[PDB]
Design a protein around this ligand. Structure first.
Ligand SMILES: [K+]
Ligand SMILES: [K+]
Ligand SMILES: [K+]
Ligand SMILES: [K+]
Ligand SMILES: [K+]
Ligand SMILES: [K+]
Ligand SMILES: [K+]
Ligand SMILES: [Mg+2]
Ligand SMILES: [Mg+2]
Ligand SMILES: [Mg+2]
Ligand SMILES: [Mg+2]
Ligand SMILES: [Mg+2]
Ligand SMILES: [Mg+2]
Ligand SMILES: [Mg+2]
Ligand SMILES: [Mg+2]
Ligand SMILES: [Mg+2]
Ligand SMILES: [Mg+2]
Ligand SMILES: [Mg+2]
Ligand SMILES: [Mg+2]
Ligand SMILES: [Mg+2]
Ligand SMILES: [Mg+2]
Ligand SMILES: [Mg+2]
Ligand SMILES: [Mg+2]
Ligand SMILES: [Mg+2]
Ligand SMILES: [Mg+2]
Ligand SMILES: [Mg+2]
Ligand SMILES: [Mg+2]
Ligand SMILES: [Mg+2]
Ligand SMILES: [Mg+2]
Ligand SMILES: [Mg+2]
Ligand SMILES: [Mg+2]
Ligand SMILES: [Mg+2]
Ligand SMILES: [Mg+2]
Ligand SMILES: [Mg+2]
Ligand SMILES: [Mg+2]
Ligand SMILES: [Mg+2]
Ligand SMILES: [Mg+2]
Ligand SMILES: [Mg+2]
Ligand SMILES: [Mg+2]
Ligand SMILES: [Mg+2]
Ligand SMILES: [Mg+2]
Ligand SMILES: [Mg+2]
Ligand SMILES: [Mg+2]
Ligand SMILES: [Mg+2]
Lengths: 48, 124, 110, 91
RNA sequence: CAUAGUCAAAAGAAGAGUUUGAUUCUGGCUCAGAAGGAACGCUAGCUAUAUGCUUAACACAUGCAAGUCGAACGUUGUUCU
RNA sequence: GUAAGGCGUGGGAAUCUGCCGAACAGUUCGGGCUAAAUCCCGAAGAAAGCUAGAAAGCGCUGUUUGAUGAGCCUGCGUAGUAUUAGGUAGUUGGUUAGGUAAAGGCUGACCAAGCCGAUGAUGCUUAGCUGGUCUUUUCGGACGAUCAGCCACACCGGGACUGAGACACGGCCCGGACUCCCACGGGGGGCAGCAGUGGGGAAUCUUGGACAAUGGGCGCAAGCCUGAUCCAGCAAUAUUGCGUGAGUGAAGAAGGGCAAUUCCGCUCGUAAAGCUCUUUCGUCGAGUGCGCGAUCAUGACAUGACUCGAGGAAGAAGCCCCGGCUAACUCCGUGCCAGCAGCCGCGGUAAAACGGGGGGGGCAAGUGUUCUUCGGAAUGACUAGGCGUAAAGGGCACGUAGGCGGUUCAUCGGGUUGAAAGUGAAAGUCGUCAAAAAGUGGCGGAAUGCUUUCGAAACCACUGAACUUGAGUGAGACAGAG
């Protein structure tokens, strides 16, 4: 039981660290996707 | 073939006919002589080879060769039959064993004489 | 009943025993629950006999009610896991033993 | 483990047959072969259509061939209804 | 100190004869090795440990292979004091 | 017999469990079997009493438990055959009653038309399965005999009873075939237990000893049972075992074989005999035995072993082969005959190939021959092969299943991957040591797998948003015995 609660505490810290890294990466993703979408919209307008 | 073909349809074995089907996977078979005769060899050999028509205990009819020089076989003599064809004579795929049952050994034979049922000559 | 008994190993005229936890209905050398150790009935070069036991597993099986056979009762007393069997109180039969010394290496009279 | 398959028959009352795929490793030829089992499962409401993706739980025997219970419909199959489709076209 | 310490879990990869006037290739046949619940021939000194109806789940003479408890219970009848 | 109701491996829920361990509560009263009871029946609440000889020791009953077994279910894995394509009709499911210790078409009734099948159902053939055995540079192939685990069966079919447990090898009932008695009315039997006998067969053992050991039944014990077992007997059937001597010896004896008939002419041959030494194995004669297996005691083996003594190289070497493959050559006889032969081939007057003499080579208490398996055989090729002319591209397409197949970003955690836990029986294989001397054991490793928990997130699968290089469209130009 002692080993189990120590293992659960370590996993609860690892999960929160990975959640924070995932959140900052997802926030970084949106600017790139918006710029890329603008580029593709310009290309489609030129072709039209 | 491809690996998928081998998965679907594997590999079969080579098909080879049995040499001595009448022995029925036994080392020897007892028999009784029906007809004792001679047969001439396939060319280029020329002789009069002493054979015997033998009915086996599993009611198979075979031709067996009588090795050595001279024999005492007649009709209705018991012979023990082992495998091994005679290359001169097609259709003769078996041998009679000398020194067992009715086929006697060859006394006076001195060399290689356990293949002819011959005992060791006692020294005097 | 679970039994702590002896299975025969070795060969002919060279007996060796294993200490087993078995169902009583099982064949002697057949099915078993557990191998618990060994016992060598032949005396070795050191002048004594050998035995090995899994002490914790023997304590487990004795705690749940396993019944030791007649030689295993003696073997488990001798290792300290069971009390002495009732017949060891009788003492040994006496008599004049031949105490003439023999040579250890050669087996002849010194 | 978790058993997930596709409904292949639903015409029985309170019963479906579910096809579950698996990969068998052919050790001699080093490939992975798809194998299918068809399992009979309990479906009390008869809510599963053919083509639905379901998850099954193990169960005690309910009938001669029924040993599973449908727990969750993961993905519902698409059914073409001509009149509802025509009404969607009119919109 | 110590009835400690040592980190092992393999080895095992051989070719020859035979198609042709000769050649190389294709392709079979045969041979040298190990083995068996084996059988047969000739010939045999010993110990030990294994193994020994593969065929007819064919028919079986004879003896044995499952009893024990008088510390569950009466019953009759043997002896002797 | 059984091709999946079995087995291997891992799980599960809807059950039971004598004896064995551990708690608690009880163990009261009538009747019946010629006599009684721990036998049978009845009442409460279920029961059963024995022992002051076993008096607080056994036994029984009820309730909770541990342990061990058993029943039931299930995922995955586990033959050949398509010159077998459809199979099923309590069949597949539902409801309700019954049955079971227990889920369940297990089955009565009613309702629906399902279920299985080209990922091979059903038919036919063969087969017990596993651990494993033999072989093999890994893989595979053949086998599943001994031994152990699981299953099935017990003269052939069908049943249930008793019981904790059986639809029960040496229990019962019924039917059948065969068989033995019968006083003729009728009864009896089941070696696929251990021995043993006929029979079949190429072929496979004693109508042995003891419960001393280990295991098992009954008994409080004393004991009694035990063809389980242990141990003897028969069989070169197997096994990296041991022995049949160690030296010396030239009249190079006699005798045998060969020879311009060379060097003691060459060789058998230092070979033998003779002489000296040692007596393993076997033989013969004795002696101790709490030597040892077994101990509190008990020893079948044991006419053994051990120790000592007697003796005398004494009692103990064959089988195949010698043309090439393949180590080993001469003489005589024979004359395509007799014969040999695994393959190629030998023999028709000088045969190293047939048969005998002489010599020699390989193995050796064996050695050949036959059968059977794997190897060599990459000769069914995963490892590791092919298809122009040698076996082998379908006459050519279209498409079902299946197999295979671009990019980025995000998510997820089924596969994948890391660790932990459970399991992977024992024996066998491998490592190592000790033991032993043809024999044993301990500890490891391996068992490449499955289940559970917790991490990882690149790949495969799945989900979402996108991309354009592969595919497909459009517009505009064309060519064509389509
Ligand atoms: K011959
Ligand atoms: K098992
Ligand atoms: K039967
Ligand atoms: K005994
Ligand atoms: K032999
Ligand atoms: K001698
Ligand atoms: K296509
Ligand atoms: Mg069922
Ligand atoms: Mg040619
Ligand atoms: Mg047998
Ligand atoms: Mg009785
Ligand atoms: Mg089929
Ligand atoms: Mg069979
Ligand atoms: Mg098999
Ligand atoms: Mg019979
Ligand atoms: Mg009983
Ligand atoms: Mg009953
Ligand atoms: Mg019987
Ligand atoms: Mg018998
Ligand atoms: Mg016979
Ligand atoms: Mg006993
Ligand atoms: Mg008792
Ligand atoms: Mg016996
Ligand atoms: Mg040997
Ligand atoms: Mg001696
Ligand atoms: Mg003696
Ligand atoms: Mg003793
Ligand atoms: Mg003896
Ligand atoms: Mg040579
Ligand atoms: Mg000549
Ligand atoms: Mg030759
Ligand atoms: Mg010759
Ligand atoms: Mg191969
Ligand atoms: Mg190879
Ligand atoms: Mg290939
Ligand atoms: Mg080829
Ligand atoms: Mg090609
Ligand atoms: Mg073509
Ligand atoms: Mg063609
Ligand atoms: Mg990505
Ligand atoms: Mg994953
Ligand atoms: Mg093991
Ligand atoms: Mg061992
Ligand atoms: Mg070892």
């Amino acid at each position: 039981e002692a080993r189990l609660v120590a293992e659960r505490a370590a996993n609860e810290e690892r999960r929160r660290l990975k959640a924070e890294a995932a959140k900052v990466r997802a926030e970084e993703r949106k600017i790139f996707q918006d710029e890329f979408r603008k580029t593709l919209m310009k290309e489609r307008a030129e072709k039209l | 073939p491809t690996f998928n073909q081998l998965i679907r349809h594997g590999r079969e074995e080579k098909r080879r006919t049995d040499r001595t089907r009448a022995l029925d996977k036994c080392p020897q078979k007892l028999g009784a002589c029906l007809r004792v005769s001679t047969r001439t060899p396939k060319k280029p050999n020329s002789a009069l080879r002493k054979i015997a028509k033998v009915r086996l205990s599993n009611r198979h009819d075979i031709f067996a060769y009588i090795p050595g020089e001279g024999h005492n076989l007649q009709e209705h003599s018991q012979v023990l039959i082992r495998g091994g064809r005679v290359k001169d004579l097609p259709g003769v795929k078996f041998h009679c064993i000398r020194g067992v049952k009715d086929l006697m050994g060859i006394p006076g034979r001195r060399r290689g004489r356990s293949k002819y049922g011959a005992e060791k000559p006692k020294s005097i | 009943v679970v039994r702590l008994r002896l299975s025969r190993l070795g060969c002919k005229n060279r007996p060796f025993f294993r200490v087993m936890a078995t169902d009583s209905r099982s064949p002697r050398d057949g099915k078993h629950i557990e191998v618990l150790g060994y016992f060598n009935p032949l005396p070795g070069q050191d002048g004594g006999k050998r035995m090995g036991l899994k002490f914790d597993r023997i304590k487990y099986w004795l705690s749940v009610g396993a019944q030791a056979s007649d030689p295993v009762q003696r073997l488990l007393f001798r290792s300290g896991l069971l009390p002495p069997p009732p017949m060891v109180a009788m003492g040994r039969k006496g008599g004049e033993r031949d105490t003439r010394p023999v040579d250890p290496m050669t087996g002849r009279f010194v | 483990k978790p058993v997930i398959g596709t409904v292949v028959s639903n015409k029985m009352q309170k019963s479906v047959v579910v096809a579950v795929d698996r990969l068998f490793h052919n050790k001699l030829y080093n490939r992975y072969v798809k194998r299918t089992s068809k399992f009979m499962a309990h479906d009390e409401t008869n809510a599963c259509n053919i083509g639905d993706r379901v998850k099954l739980d193990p169960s005690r025997p309910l009938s001669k061939h029924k040993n599973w219970i449908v727990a969750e419909i993961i993905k519902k199959a698409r059914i073409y209804s001509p009149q509802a489709a025509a009404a969607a076209a009119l919109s």
